[PDB]
Protein: Deoxyguanosinetriphosphate triphosphohydrolase-like protein 1
Amino acid sequence: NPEWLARNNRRNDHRSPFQRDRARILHSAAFRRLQAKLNDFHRTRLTHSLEAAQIGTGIVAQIKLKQPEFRELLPSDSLIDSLCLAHDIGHPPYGHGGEIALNYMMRDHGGFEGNAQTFRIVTSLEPYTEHHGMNLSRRTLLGLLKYPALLSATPPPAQLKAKDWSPAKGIYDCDLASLDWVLEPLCESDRELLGQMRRKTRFKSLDCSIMELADDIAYGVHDLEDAIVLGMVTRAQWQEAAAAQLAECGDPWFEEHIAELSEMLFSGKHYVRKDAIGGIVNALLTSISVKPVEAPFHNELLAFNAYIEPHMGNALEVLKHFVSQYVIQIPQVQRFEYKGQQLIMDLFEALSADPERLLPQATGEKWRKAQEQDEGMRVICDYIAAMTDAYAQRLHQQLF
Amino acid sequence: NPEWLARNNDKIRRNDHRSPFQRDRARILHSAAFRRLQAKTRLTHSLEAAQIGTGIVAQIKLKQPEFRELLPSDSLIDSLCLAHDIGHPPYGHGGEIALNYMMRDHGGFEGNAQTFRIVTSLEPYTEHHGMNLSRRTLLGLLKYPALLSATRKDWSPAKGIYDCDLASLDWVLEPLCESDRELLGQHRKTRFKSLDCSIMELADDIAYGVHDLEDAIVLGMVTRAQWQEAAAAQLAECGDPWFEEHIAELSEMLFSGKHYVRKDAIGGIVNALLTSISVKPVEAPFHNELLAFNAYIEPHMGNALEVLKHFVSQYVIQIPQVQRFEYKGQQLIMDLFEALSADPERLLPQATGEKWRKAQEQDEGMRVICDYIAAMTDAYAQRLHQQLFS
Ligand code: NI
Ligand code: NI
Structure:
């Protein structure tokens, strides 16, 4: 249906709707901010999103070669590009630590969650248009609904514990109008099935399943090289954790190649390590196919997802778990997040103490307008959510 | 009795013919807990106490030969003075107050308790018994030989031994008869201590009294006008003849501005305090010779020392620049404790995170966090605090 190319709102511009979405995302302030989030390491959320985008287009290429039946349905290069460039747009300062703080400070006003924030930025906050954010095409928006339910569908009481305040995932109720618009050309039967729970949503569109696989592959492999050279993991820990589990993961290529992959990763030469990384990436990409979703969805973008081969899934889950155990869940990273969450909570409590007086004037004006609907807190939340770590540190110093 | 020379666990190389106390001294010097005294110096203070301590032993065994066999060897009295201050946390008394408050529902915190816990359990020289020192050395570190359950500015800690260290305290006191053990446990304050520990306490007191006094005068923290009114006048009436006679000159040698003249005044004071110590029997029907005798300073000489100690605390410690530093330190320690106990597994170092997981099977995680903070230097605690809050 051409309704998937429509937007909420030149002669020589012959680009597809998806090429225009990619250009908008590339130009947005929200995208440029991912560059902020004694060595020469510069891996950011922006570089993570470029690598996901390049894996995404490679996944599409492999499916259009092995499954021609689906060549009309698969996303174009710029559509899968657009979903990977945007997937991390909504993340707050200080990663999960920022997210926990904002969610707790919004406990009585809809909460905070990064995927919801991503939806809110592209449909409203990014000022590319006056009233519809980046004003992206409907299918692009559908590809961004990793959790296509409202947070009303998906309380903790009682120094703060991370387990107690991790947000549920979904779409803010204050963005329901833009969600209703995205789901409008769906039959009622597809619409009531899309919000079905496994609370945790179960379903997503085909374009979004591809982006999720590319994101998961990027996270799994492209963090791994610099973890090795920075010394965050030794050869011994790689053998005990990753290599042994990959030798028993059940996929024949990994069981065959792990010994040689481990020697290449610890070669000490970039031109050798990249071939291990390239082979891992390629082994994972070539193991993805589109199969039908186990729900009686009627719309083709919901009736089919891309799935990775299960034994290959175990290998990917070993890699993702490994980067989480030696790159993220280390005290050096977790203290930075604790500090960030203490910082975010300070800014919120001061700024909500008197928003008109302390907010920048343009944000103060948005706060006054929003109080006609008593949604002032969400304005403070958007403002803190769009800060970089450096901007938040500077605001905190001005206040404390 | 050999039992005193024993260690909690059992090989010595055939060519090692050192006494148990020479090996205790070597372990203490090689420990990380000792090396930390350079940051906290407390190491300088402990070397001064050690060298005063052997001075006391030498002078007693010359005036009271009946006790030559009983007095501690040089390496034993060395070990107790080198180890005495191991348990002190960052920020000194302000740190001690904050930790004890954060541990109010879990056994408290106290520096002398921490010292015992480090040498019996925490220092990883052995897998299960810390530095595994000889029993008599351990007995010498028990300035307060009761449990903190018996002895428990409002938060200053009571003094004693942690209940979580009851096993190694029982082991240390095991070769004592019932009557000695029930006499040793006699805020409440303990009354008794071993001979080795009485000599060490005198050495720590003389070193605190005089060697802190020397830098305060050069550093300008005390001028002659306040020295004359507070300490010098009080020493002219303290009842010790040596101080009443020699106070006027010493006061001019102390403000000479020449290091080698000043050393003579300090040296004369220390020797004066040192020669006025003797071994007398303890006022209790103890059977064990190490508990039946203490070293005591002659009472009038004792009053002069308390004039010296009160002057060093009133003009070097109880001054606002130092006290504000202690208020900050205690806010900083409480900050760390609240972040760390908020999520230990994510915030503690992985080795310490592991000890916390193991310790909660006995619901002893709070003591692991307290151990970790107590072992920080000021620079460590300050850098950790910045990682969590600034
Ligand atoms: Ni990602
Ligand atoms: Ni001392």
